[PDB]
Amino acid sequence: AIRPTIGQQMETGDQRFGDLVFRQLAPNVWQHTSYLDMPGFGAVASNGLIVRDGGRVLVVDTAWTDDQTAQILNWIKQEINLPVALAVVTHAHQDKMGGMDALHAAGIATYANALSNQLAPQEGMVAAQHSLTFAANGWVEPATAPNFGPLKVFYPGPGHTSDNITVGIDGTDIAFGGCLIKDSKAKSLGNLGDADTEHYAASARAFGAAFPKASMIVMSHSAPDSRAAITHTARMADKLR
Ligand SMILES: CC1(C)S[C@H]([C@H](NC(=O)[C@H](N)c2ccccc2)C(=O)O)N[C@H]1C(=O)O
Ligand SMILES: [Mn+2]
Ligand SMILES: [Mn+2]
Ligand SMILES: [Mn+2]
């Protein structure tokens, strides 16, 4: 078993594949987990999603590294055996965009918030090949998200970072909050170094309101949780103002 310093531990049902862990969340949704070994600190787990949409697969977030991301693609090849149509990455930090090069090498179309793409070079990341833009209420402009199938992308406002986006999985009760949302028992909001402390609470609540019927909330650094992850995150964020 992989036993990270930060992130959910392994439980029955989890599948180890190389350096990664996969968990099935729904008949057509899996969580991918990759681990950054921080020298002297141990492993930091990061989670994304894999969604089957008929004869194709859609990915949310890379792994920390290109090699780990290539392993995700290998797992998809083995277990699903369908092509990856596109990937969405949820902001311009290593845990979410560290593996862009592996996606590009594989010929997978990549999408991110326009702002994430603009920040990427300043964060030592490679930009996605396509930019998503958003309405004044946070919903993605549909023309910028062509053929996204069940992925419903929502920009909740600045929180964990100014560019953080979130993704609901239509046809399921799952929504993905990325690094914006922390678990219902969290002691902290993680790294606030790039955070908007004024708007964080409202942004967390906006995510909840965008996907009001989602009962399983997936996030970057803990196991899937209830909507209490959203409300607890917002309550922690209320204290920052
Ligand atoms: C897990 C984190 C505390 S670190 C990660 C991210 N940081 C990185 O991706 C850095 N490249 C990094 C540097 C040293 C050790 C780990 C990550 C961030 O600052 O939001 N996301 C944070 C978070 O989601 O709260
Ligand atoms: Mn981050
Ligand atoms: Mn993170
Ligand atoms: Mn402001």
Q: Who's near 51: CB < 8 A, 6+ residues apart?
A: 28, 29, 30, 57, 58, 59, 60, 149, 150, 151, 169
Q: Which two tokens stand for residue 112?
A: 């991110």
Q: Which residue has the CA at smallest separation from atom 13 of ligand 1?
A: 94
Residue type, 88: V
Q: How many domains does the chain have?
A: 1
- Residue 208 tokens, joined: 């909840």
Q: Is residue 5 within 6 Å of ligand 1 at its C-beta?
A: no
- The ligand 1 atom at the shortest distance from the C-alpha of residue 192 is 25
Does residue 165 come out as left (phi exceeding 0), alpha (psi in the -120 to 50 range) or beta? beta
Cα(1)–Cα(172) distance, integer angstroms: 29
Partners of residue 112 on adjacent β-strands: 89, 131
Ligand 1 pocket, residue 209 CB under 6 Å: no
Element (H, E) at 216: strand 216-218
Sequence ranges of the binding site for substrate: 182, 191
Other CB atoms within 10 A of residue 182 CB:
25
User: Which helix (DSSP H) or strand (DSSP E) does residue 99 occupy?
Assistant: none
190 Cβ below 6 A of ligand 1: yes
Residue 51's φ and ψ, nearest 5 degrees, are: -125, 130
Side chain identity, residue 191: N
Q: Whose CA is nearest to atom 15 of ligand 1?
A: 38
Q: How far apart are CA 115 and CA 155, in angstroms?
A: 11
Q: Where are the strands (E) in 61-184, listed by range?
A: 84-89, 109-113, 130-132, 151-154, 166-169, 174-176
Atom of ligand 1 nearest to the CA of 38: 15
State both tokens at 152.
Answer: 């419903």
Contact 233, 182 (CB under 8 A): yes
Cβ(59)–Cβ(151) under 8 Å? Answer: no
Query: Checking DSSP bridges between strand 166-169 and strand 216-218, what pairing results, if any?
Result: unpaired
- Nearest partner of 174 among 207, 215, 139, judged by Cα: 215
Bridge partners of 154, per DSSP, are 139, 166
Q: Note residues around ion ligand 2 (Cβ under 5 angstroms).
A: 93, 179
181 alpha-carbon distance from chain centroid? 10
Torsion of Cα atoms, 166 then 19 then 73 then 104, to 10°: 70
Instruction: Give the other-Cβ count within 10 Å of 122's Cβ.
Output: 8
To one decimal place, what's the resolution in Å? 1.5
Domain range for 64: 1-241
Q: Which helix (H) or strand (E) holds 22?
A: strand 20-26
Distance 142 CA to ligand 1 centre (A): 30
Helix (H) or strand (E) holding 159: none
> Is the CB of residue 38 below 6 angstroms from any atom belonging to ligand 1?
yes
Residue 142: CATH number of its domain:
3.60.15.10
Half-sphere exposure of 30 (CA within 13 A, CB side): 23
Give the CA dihedral 48, 179, 159, 240, nearest 10 degrees. Answer: 160
Contact 218, 47 (CB under 8 A): yes
Segment (H or E) for 202: helix 200-210
Q: Are 44 and 50 in contact (CB under 8 A)?
A: no
Residue 36: closest CA among 11, 18, 19, 16: 19
- Between CA 66 and CA 94 the distance in angstroms is 11
- Resolved by: X-ray
Report the distance separating Cα 175 and Cα 51, nearest Å.
Answer: 12
Protein residue with least CA distance to atom 1, ligand 1: 190
User: For 39, how many CA atoms within 13 A lie in the half-sphere containing its CB?
Assistant: 0
Residue 182's contacts (CB-CB under 8 Å, 6 or more residues apart) are: 188, 189, 190, 219, 221, 222, 229, 232, 233, 236
By DSSP bridging, strand 15-17 and strand 20-26 are: antiparallel
| Nearest CA residue ID for atom 19, ligand 1 | 191
Which of 37, 62, 179 is the best mutation target for the ligand 1 pocket, counting ligand atoms within 8 Å of the beta carbon and taking the most? 179
200 C-alpha to ligand 1 centroid (Å): 17
- Give the Cβ contact number of residue 187 at 10 Å: 7
Pocket residue to mutate for ligand 1, from 90, 94, 125, most atoms within 8 A of Cβ: 94
What is the DSSP code (8-state) at residue 70? Answer: H
